A = this chain, B = another copy of it.
Amino acid sequence: AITCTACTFTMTDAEFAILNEGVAAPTIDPRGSFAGLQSLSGAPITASASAGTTTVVVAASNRNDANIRTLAQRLRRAAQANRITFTA
């Protein structure tokens, strides 16, 4: 009965566009770093924009350990490759 209730990451629009291959918040570019997550029910990763801030979360029924680990790994790799700071 172990569940993950929140896996949320916060970014700015510029950095998200850098890591989404220049595509804006609402959709996920297939060539970007947010594509390839395993889909248990629909889109595993969703992104929203508000006041210049982009929120990237794992979907409600896709929050298994593998998706969380892959998202964290891809965020770290993209930040290091693109000289972005992954603050704790």
List chain A positions with a Cβ less than 8 A from chain B: 1-12, 15, 40, 55, 61-65, 67-69, 72-73, 75-76, 79, 84-88
A88 and B87 CA atoms in complex are apart in Å by: 26
Q: A interface, by DSSP: helix, strand, loop or mixed?
A: mixed
A48 CB, min distance to chain B CBs, angstroms = 13
B10 near A7: Cβ-Cβ < 8 Å? no
Task: Evaluate contact between A11 and B4: CB separation under 8 angstroms.
Answer: no
- How near does chain B come to A81, taking the closest CB pair, in angstroms? 12
A6 pairs with B7, CB closer than 8 A: yes
Return chain B residues, CB-CB under 8 Å to A10: 2-5
Residues of the B chain whose Cβ atoms lie less than 8 Å from the Cβ of A75: 2, 65
